């Protein structure tokens, strides 16, 4: 019977209560104070141009109807009471397929303070669009937004804001960082309104600032490109008579380089513009292709089929000697320009 007092209170709150009418309809504007505790920043999906994020989505708003006076100053209730009272219809403007967790019971807490204030937290895994510009890819940094506002209620109907200072209202747990290639820097929040034919709606924008970690694409892509770049010039070191040796060297290098170019592309969605890797791969494609033309030039002047034996014999080609030094030097200066260009 001790719980009967709390059951009796909950009956008085819901009777004569309308889930369709927002708090203070007409008489007042509804002010919703929202907070986010990002429990885990899910893996950014560059292929889908979206990102996953697992959050506790707190929302607080004053509702005069849900006012009580009992032994407990605050009622901690399960999700089942949330569906029977008005809650903001908050939706994520850039939100793709998103799932509200349900295991074991619905992961939503309702908490009604005696004054009337509510706290309505829910656990979500929202996949939101994060449009990306990949000119600097792989050494690119993005600011993925997460906009959320009411769907049916215009700026004069419900207005959102941050419970704490705006700086301290999006909290990311240190333990939870599920990013692999990206790295979270910080979170910046801003408020605005969005113009719609249906009306003017308030938005709560928050930008999660990310940065790619170049470490993966170094060993995965840049090093194999560099080895193929290195492998191409080894044919300069090999003697000129060994036509099959250098030929097999050069043709192998281009085919390997071509495979790397295709390999890099599938890591990213199709895009009209060429990323930074595409320029590194392209110029790497030039050195490997240029090396073959150097060998082809040597074959033009490789008059004597017979090699040197320890009559005339083939001398080491002048182009071969100069290609020995110029090519590694020309590639080295390029790396300094390339790496300095994008890293800084």
């Amino acid at each position, epitope marked *: 019977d001790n719980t009967t007092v709390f059951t009796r209170i909950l009956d008085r709150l819901l009777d004569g209560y309308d889930n369709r009418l927002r708090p203070g309809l007409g008489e007042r504007v509804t002010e919703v104070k929202t907070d986010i505790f990002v429990t885990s920043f899910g893996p950014v999906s560059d292929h889908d141009m979206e990102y996953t994020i697992d959050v506790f989505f707190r929302q607080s708003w004053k509702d005069e109807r849900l006012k009580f006076k009992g032994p407990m100053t605050v009622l901690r209730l399960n999700n089942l009471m949330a569906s029977k009272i008005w809650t903001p219809d908050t939706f994520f403007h850039n939100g793709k397929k998103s799932v509200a967790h349900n295991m074991t019971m619905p992961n939503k807490l309702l908490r009604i303070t005696e004054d009337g204030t509510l706290l309505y937290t829910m656990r979500l895994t929202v996949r939101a669009e994060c449009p990306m510009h990949l000119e600097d890819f792989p050494m690119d940094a993005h600011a993925c937004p997460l906009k959320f506002g009411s769907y049916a209620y215009t700026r004069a109907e419900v207005v959102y804001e941050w419970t704490r*200072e705006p*700086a301290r209202s999006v909290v990311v747990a240190e333990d939870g960082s599920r990013l692999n290639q990206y790295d979270l820097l910080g979170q*910046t*929040v801003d*408020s605005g309104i969005v113009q719609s034919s249906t009306g003017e709606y308030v938005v709560m924008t928050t930008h999660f600032h990310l940065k790619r970690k170049i470490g993966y694409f170094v060993i995965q892509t840049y090093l194999p490109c560099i080895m193929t770049v290195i492998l191409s010039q080894v044919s300069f070191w090999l003697n000129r008579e060994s036509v099959p040796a250098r030929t097999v060297f050069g043709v192998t290098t281009v085919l390997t380089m071509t495979t790397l170019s295709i390999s890099a592309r599938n890591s990213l969605p199709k895009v009209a513009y060429a990323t930074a890797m595409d320029w590194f791969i392209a110029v790497c494609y030039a050195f490997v292709f240029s090396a073959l033309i150097e060998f082809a030039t040597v074959n033009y002047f490789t008059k004597r089929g017979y090699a040197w034996d320890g009559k005339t014999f083939n001398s080491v080609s002048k182009i071969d000697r100069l290609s020995r030094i110029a090519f590694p030097l020309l590639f080295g200066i390029f790396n300094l320009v390339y790496w300095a260009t994008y890293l800084n």
Partner: antibody
Amino acid sequence: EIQLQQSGPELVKPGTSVKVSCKASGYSFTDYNMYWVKQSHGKSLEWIGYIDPYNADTTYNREFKGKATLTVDKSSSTAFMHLNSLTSEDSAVYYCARKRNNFYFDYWGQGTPLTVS
Amino acid sequence: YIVMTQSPKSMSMSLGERVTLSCRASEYVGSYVSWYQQKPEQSPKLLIYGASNRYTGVPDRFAGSGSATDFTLTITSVQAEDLADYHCGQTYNYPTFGGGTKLEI
């Protein structure tokens, strides 16, 4: 008609403690935080602290941490600031303000000049 | 905290004409920069809440344009009551106000 009326002007010698009371009239007191701002003559406005009247939680400026103590009396709808170890640097004008949004300090107090000798 | 600085410490201009006040923020503040007016022996009066929006009851001559860090308050036509000492606050983090620009003929 919102009107934040702070206490009258006073001046006490160094080493004493002084309390100034900020009184809210129109709006509901507990809904919005109450801030405290210090301004020396010919100087910028400096934040002291804010107190959420309902939970009575307080957050203080690092410089004024310990120097200033904020307490509230919801029954009278009055916010109190307590100062201790008064010095020459504490001679200034102490304002009271509310925060209606993350954007602006809607209504300010009348001001409460403080000087020491 | 975030440091707010106002470029023109004192601006001189007669009645009418255009007068623009600047206010830079040390780091990001979004659209949360407010502007306040304090004539001497008086409390501050809010003018431009948010980067651009104008508070109710303010004359329409007051206009403000904001960016990530650089913010401005411009008066299209100056009037006798317009001359005052202005302050630009921030609220994206714990509050911190600017040095305070002053106007006189």
